[PDB]
Design an enzyme around this catalytic site. Structure first.
Site, mmCIF file in Angstrom:
data_model
loop_
_atom_site.group_PDB
_atom_site.id
_atom_site.type_symbol
_atom_site.label_atom_id
_atom_site.label_comp_id
_atom_site.label_asym_id
_atom_site.label_seq_id
_atom_site.Cartn_x
_atom_site.Cartn_y
_atom_site.Cartn_z
ATOM 1 N N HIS A 61 2.598 -1.544 9.718
ATOM 2 C CA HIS A 61 1.376 -2.243 9.356
ATOM 3 C C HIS A 61 1.680 -3.407 8.425
ATOM 4 O O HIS A 61 1.209 -4.526 8.657
ATOM 5 C CB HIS A 61 0.370 -1.254 8.713
ATOM 6 C CG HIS A 61 0.127 -0.020 9.537
ATOM 7 N ND1 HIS A 61 -0.526 -0.045 10.754
ATOM 8 C CD2 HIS A 61 0.433 1.278 9.310
ATOM 9 C CE1 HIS A 61 -0.614 1.183 11.238
ATOM 10 N NE2 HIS A 61 -0.027 2.005 10.386
ATOM 11 N N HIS A 91 2.600 -4.384 -1.499
ATOM 12 C CA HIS A 91 2.682 -4.900 -0.138
ATOM 13 C C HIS A 91 1.774 -6.116 -0.054
ATOM 14 O O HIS A 91 1.051 -6.433 -0.997
ATOM 15 C CB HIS A 91 2.260 -3.833 0.876
ATOM 16 C CG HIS A 91 0.838 -3.419 0.672
ATOM 17 N ND1 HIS A 91 0.463 -2.426 -0.200
ATOM 18 C CD2 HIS A 91 -0.320 -3.953 1.146
ATOM 19 C CE1 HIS A 91 -0.864 -2.344 -0.233
ATOM 20 N NE2 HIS A 91 -1.373 -3.280 0.565
ATOM 21 N N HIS A 93 -0.805 -8.638 2.781
ATOM 22 C CA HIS A 93 -1.520 -8.894 4.020
ATOM 23 C C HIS A 93 -1.444 -10.396 4.260
ATOM 24 O O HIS A 93 -1.543 -11.175 3.303
ATOM 25 C CB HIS A 93 -2.994 -8.469 3.896
ATOM 26 C CG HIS A 93 -3.162 -7.042 3.449
ATOM 27 N ND1 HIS A 93 -3.424 -6.018 4.318
ATOM 28 C CD2 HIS A 93 -3.061 -6.458 2.228
ATOM 29 C CE1 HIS A 93 -3.489 -4.869 3.655
ATOM 30 N NE2 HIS A 93 -3.272 -5.098 2.379
ATOM 31 N N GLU A 103 -7.503 -10.615 2.371
ATOM 32 C CA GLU A 103 -8.526 -9.603 2.610
ATOM 33 C C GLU A 103 -9.777 -9.951 1.811
ATOM 34 O O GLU A 103 -10.852 -10.179 2.375
ATOM 35 C CB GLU A 103 -7.951 -8.224 2.265
ATOM 36 C CG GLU A 103 -6.762 -7.876 3.166
ATOM 37 C CD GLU A 103 -6.606 -6.404 3.375
ATOM 38 O OE1 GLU A 103 -6.453 -5.691 2.369
ATOM 39 O OE2 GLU A 103 -6.656 -5.969 4.537
ATOM 40 N N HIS A 116 -0.971 -6.864 -2.951
ATOM 41 C CA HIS A 116 -1.585 -5.679 -3.534
ATOM 42 C C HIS A 116 -0.529 -4.865 -4.264
ATOM 43 O O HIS A 116 0.394 -4.335 -3.639
ATOM 44 C CB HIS A 116 -2.222 -4.815 -2.437
ATOM 45 C CG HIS A 116 -3.429 -5.446 -1.851
ATOM 46 N ND1 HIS A 116 -3.956 -5.082 -0.628
ATOM 47 C CD2 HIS A 116 -4.196 -6.442 -2.335
ATOM 48 C CE1 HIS A 116 -5.019 -5.846 -0.405
ATOM 49 N NE2 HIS A 116 -5.178 -6.675 -1.421
ATOM 50 N N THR A 195 -8.016 -0.592 1.882
ATOM 51 C CA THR A 195 -8.392 -1.513 2.949
ATOM 52 C C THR A 195 -7.757 -1.157 4.279
ATOM 53 O O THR A 195 -7.988 -1.864 5.261
ATOM 54 C CB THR A 195 -8.059 -2.965 2.611
ATOM 55 O OG1 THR A 195 -6.647 -3.082 2.597
ATOM 56 C CG2 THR A 195 -8.660 -3.413 1.292
ATOM 57 N N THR A 196 -6.992 -0.084 4.334
ATOM 58 C CA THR A 196 -6.470 0.450 5.576
ATOM 59 C C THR A 196 -6.889 1.902 5.666
ATOM 60 O O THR A 196 -7.100 2.559 4.639
ATOM 61 C CB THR A 196 -4.939 0.379 5.687
ATOM 62 O OG1 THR A 196 -4.349 1.142 4.649
ATOM 63 C CG2 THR A 196 -4.436 -1.014 5.615
HETATM 64 C C1 LIG Z 1 -2.075 4.167 1.013
HETATM 65 C C2 LIG Z 1 -2.704 2.825 0.721
HETATM 66 C C3 LIG Z 1 -2.501 2.184 -0.494
HETATM 67 C C4 LIG Z 1 -3.051 0.933 -0.758
HETATM 68 C C5 LIG Z 1 -3.837 0.312 0.204
HETATM 69 S S1 LIG Z 1 -4.627 -1.240 -0.136
HETATM 70 N N1 LIG Z 1 -4.350 -2.208 1.120
HETATM 71 O O1 LIG Z 1 -6.008 -0.971 -0.263
HETATM 72 O O2 LIG Z 1 -3.931 -1.780 -1.290
HETATM 73 C C6 LIG Z 1 -4.072 0.948 1.416
HETATM 74 C C7 LIG Z 1 -3.508 2.191 1.661
HETATM 75 ZN ZN LIG Z 2 -3.294 -3.807 0.806
#
Ligand SMILES: Cc1ccc(S(N)(=O)=O)cc1
Ligand SMILES: [Zn+2]
Ligand SMILES: OC[C@H]1O[C@@H](O)[C@H](O)[C@@H](O)[C@@H]1O
Ligand SMILES: OC[C@H]1O[C@@H](O)[C@H](O)[C@@H](O)[C@@H]1O
Ligand SMILES: OC[C@H]1O[C@H](O)[C@H](O)[C@@H](O)[C@@H]1O
Ligand SMILES: Cc1ccc(S(N)(=O)=O)cc1
Length: 257
Positions: A61, A91, A93, A103, A116, A195-196
């Site tokens: 992802h 990570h 996006h 996002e 993030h 957000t996932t």
């Molecule tokens: C396990 C997980 C951790 C962090 C996110 S996020 N894109 O909301 O930072 C999504 C899933």
């Molecule tokens: Zn994220």
């Protein structure tokens, strides 16, 4: 089975994750005119000097840079937060083109990417317990725009060819996440979600107002990653962002007057 394509992307997620239509989903559009300065916010403290990065993983992802979270080595405190939140991973996006990828949006404007930095509330002992709590997580979000190169991002860029496909990892020790921050810590904050999938409603979002600049060459290398595994047909890892979700019964607060 979820992803970002036409057949498994954000508009499909609710069928297996019904909280996708919930009351505190993320991301959201940040209407800067409606956001209100909040004098009750305490000073924000990003304390990353003892961070211990370990590994970088292509999870199909995005890619995650993982940290040792077995003690309070890299923590976020203050601002809207009650207590101490420990860094577990970061990570990004990003888009297929510089005009999309973030996002969160700012007055509907989409940035090229969004970083993030994910933290969990130490009062709950482990990330898994934290994601059973309304205040289990804090995510520090940072926008990326394309301009000058970000020197502190280059080590990330340069390891990506070794984790091209889903399931690959590489050692990633001695990386300093402080090199990914902008100068200012001015921010907006609101309660939201992952957000996932599984889209869990556990997150205090802290979104910095000042973007970082990265070069076109840096983001182009993000776009050479693959969603697929080794030996499978190539699907470029691009457009791995969820669009803005309804704000519902929420207010965005600003740290700045
Ligand atoms: C396990 C997980 C951790 C962090 C996110 S996020 N894109 O909301 O930072 C999504 C899933
Ligand atoms: Zn994220
Ligand atoms: O190597 C990345 C970072 O690791 C941390 O544990 C150190 O305390 C920092 O001085 C260093 O910049
Ligand atoms: O009732 C007045 C209060 O309304 C709330 O919605 C706002 O968040 C507060 O800043 C304000 O003081
Ligand atoms: O700091 C993250 C990584 O940056 C570079 O790839 C270095 O060669 C490697 O030793 C380090 O683990
Ligand atoms: C084939 C398939 C499509 C979409 C999903 S979802 N609801 O996890 O996005 C799962 C399986």
């Amino acid at each position: 089975h979820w992803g970002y394509g036409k057949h498994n992307g954000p508009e499909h997620w609710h069928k297996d994750f019904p909280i996708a239509k919930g009351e505190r989903q993320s991301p959201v559009d940040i209407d800067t005119h409606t956001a209100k300065y909040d004098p009750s916010l305490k000073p924000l403290s990003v304390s990353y000097d003892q961070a211990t990065s370990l590994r970088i993983l292509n999870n199909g992802h995005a890619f995650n840079v993982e940290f040792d979270d077995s003690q309070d080595k890299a923590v976020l405190k203050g601002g809207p937060l009650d207590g101490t939140y420990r860094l577990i991973q970061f990570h990004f996006h990003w888009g297929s083109l510089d005009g999309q990828g973030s996002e969160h949006t700012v007055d509907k404007k989409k940035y090229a990417a969004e970083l993030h930095l994910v933290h969990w509330n130490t009062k709950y002992g482990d990330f898994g317990k934290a994601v059973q709590q309304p205040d289990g997580l804090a995510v520090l979000g940072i926008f990326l725009k394309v301009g000058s190169a970000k020197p502190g991002l280059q080590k990330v860029v340069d390891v990506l060819d070794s984790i091209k496909t889903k399931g690959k990892s590489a050692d990633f020790t001695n990386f300093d996440p402080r090199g990914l921050l902008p100068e200012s810590l001015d921010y907006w904050t609101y309660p939201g979600s992952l957000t996932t999938p599984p889209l869990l409603e556990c997150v205090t979002w802290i979104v910095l107002k000042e973007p970082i600049s990265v070069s076109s060459e840096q983001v182009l290398k993000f776009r050479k990653l693959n969603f697929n595994g080794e030996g499978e047909p190539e699907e470029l890892m691009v457009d791995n962002w969820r669009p803005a979700q309804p704000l519902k019964n929420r207010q965005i607060k600003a740290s700045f007057k």
